[PDB]
Design a protein around this ligand. Structure first.
Ligand SMILES: C[S@@+](CC[C@H](N)C(=O)[O-])C[C@H]1O[C@@H](n2cnc3c(N)ncnc32)[C@H](O)[C@@H]1O
Ligand SMILES: C[S@@+](CC[C@H](N)C(=O)[O-])C[C@H]1O[C@@H](n2cnc3c(N)ncnc32)[C@H](O)[C@@H]1O
Lengths: 189, 195
């Protein structure tokens, strides 16, 4: 038994909260790993909304899910996660954010603070009470660094009466260990 | 289902790691809540070492454990946790730290950075591989911020090849929400530099 990294822990937190038949969101599709993960947890009567701004990422995720017989429960949308409210009107149980750039792709196309903060606000509104958002933050680069600073600033201002914002950090590791943020809705209004 | 605070999460982390028959330590006895908790996890053939520097805290912990039929496997020691190596020679599975002053007690008698750091080194040495230390850090109020700052600065320096050090923090809460640090041993030995 070993304490998992932030990427591993996000899956563990999602498994705790997501049951079968739920509506969940992968806000950052990429290659489709988290999308397939969310799809397997949610079952045949559940729904996964997936978002990416790249055609390469949507195609790779479509390929992944079709291979695993999971494409039927997934709605893939080629739009920014900051516009997630245009496509979803029901309450969601969970939203996964994995911040940064697509692996084995274009490294100049990455998540931006402005649109991430927007998506987070939309995700927080869409959440059912007792619902979870997980944010795996990468900060290795200049662009990663800038996003971490801004996202965390924003999340520090979230009403504690409405949301629990939990940060998990490995403080003795060098070379920017990825940070986990868990946001759980506890009250409406 | 709700995400627990640091205090609640420390117990959850301890439950993950501690099985029956293990040797565990409560480094900050207080009223004996964590001591009782450790005693119930560890069973008849296990051992709990408890530490505090106050006579009031040892007596309240003794009363607690006797009331719950748990005093049998607990060794209560009226000494600082910085001296835990004088009393323990076997490898331990877990150590619990709860930093601050005694609740419903003397507010000026609290854990000090120097001795906490010492006890943390001793606990880290005493830990079996795959063992855990949990540290609930209280700060602000009468307690102040100096212990939090120094303990965390010390723990940032711990060899990552030997220990995982994980901080859990509620960043949208005001009024100094307690911080959880989890230290897990992943390797025996130590890498020292050169002189
Ligand atoms: C770190 S990757 C996600 C990792 C993914 N979970 C996986 O396993 O492959 C971040 C993704 O978010 C996408 N992205 C960047 N900006 C976005 C935006 N504004 N809205 C939605 N997605 C965006 C990128 O195209 C990239 O594929
Ligand atoms: C926050 S309280 C612990 C709470 C306790 N776990 C409980 O169940 O109530 C901190 C305790 O550590 C004790 N303490 C202070 N300095 C100590 C030291 N150097 N060694 C051992 N205990 C110490 C205090 O007397 C106090 O009882």
């Amino acid at each position: 038994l070993t304490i998992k990294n932030s990427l591993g822990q996000s899956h563990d937190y999602i498994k705790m909260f997501v049951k079968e038949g739920d509506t969940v969101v992968d806000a950052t599709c990429g290659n489709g790993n988290d999308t397939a993960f969310l799809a397997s947890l949610v079952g045949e009567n559940g729904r996964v909304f997936g978002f990416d701004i790249q055609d390469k990422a949507i195609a790779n995720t479509t390929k992944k899910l079709t291979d695993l017989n999971l494409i039927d429960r997934v709605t893939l949308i080629k739009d920014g996660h900051q516009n997630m409210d245009k496509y979803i009107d029901c309450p969601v149980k969970a939203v996964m954010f994995n911040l940064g750039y697509l692996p084995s792709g274009d490294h100049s196309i990455s998540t931006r603070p402005e649109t991430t903060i927007q998506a987070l606000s939309k995700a927080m509104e869409l959440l059912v009470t007792g619902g979870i958002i997980t944010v795996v933050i990468y900060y290795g680069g200049d662009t990663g660094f800038e996003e971490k600073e801004k996202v965390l600033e924003f999340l520090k201002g979230v009403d504690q009466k409405k949301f629990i914002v939990q940060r998990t950090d490995f403080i003795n590791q060098a070379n920017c260990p990825p940070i986990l943020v868990c946001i759980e809705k506890i009250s409406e209004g």
